[PDB]
Amino acid sequence: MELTPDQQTLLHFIMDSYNKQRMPQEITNKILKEAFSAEENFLILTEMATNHVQVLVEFTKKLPGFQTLDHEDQIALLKGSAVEAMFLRSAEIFNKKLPSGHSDLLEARIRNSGISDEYITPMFSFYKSIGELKMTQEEYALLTAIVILSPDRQYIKDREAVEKLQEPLLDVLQKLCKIHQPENPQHFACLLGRLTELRTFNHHHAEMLHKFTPLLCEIWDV
């Protein structure tokens, strides 16, 4: 079992643009240096979530065929996926990108930001659940692209055009599972499991909602 030249090209495009993004040093310094208060910790999450939306727009633009979509649907896709993309990237950073001791300081700030435990508890549970799957970078990059290119978001004029962009990504992701996990025929079903979990975070987030960044206010419709 192997990826066709077409699936390889499409995968290489997703991977390249996914690796382009990174956490700013200017943010990393705040995690280390800024005061440990509910106001200061909430301000750090605001900075991190804003940077993520900017990184999410750069990734989204480079998605094969995204630019061929109607300009209005491009906005509805960005708005519909922002929250889910944030939680998936948050899971990635938690299980990967941060040093052992720095992650503890970040967790300390996420748990002391004045956000209720009825939301903080399923959040860390979700990161832990993602961590258990031991997802490769290709899986993180494909899941993020599938999340963004969801044909079932509200206010999309041409859903069929979006279906045509997402279906090839689900085909690549399923084929990668068959190639790398042939002994785990439930691996693809587990990844789809995280996609449904991610969708509950839209409900948790709206209930979760100090005024936020313009980039956040607009992409969340608050």
């Binding site: 727009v57 989204t60 633009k61 906005i75 960005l78 607009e218 992409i219």
Partner: peptide, 11 residues
């Protein structure tokens, strides 16, 4: 509405 999102997507 969403002027900055529009700016980022088209820049």
């Amino acid at each position: 509405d969403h002027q900055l999102l529009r700016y980022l997507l088209d820049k």
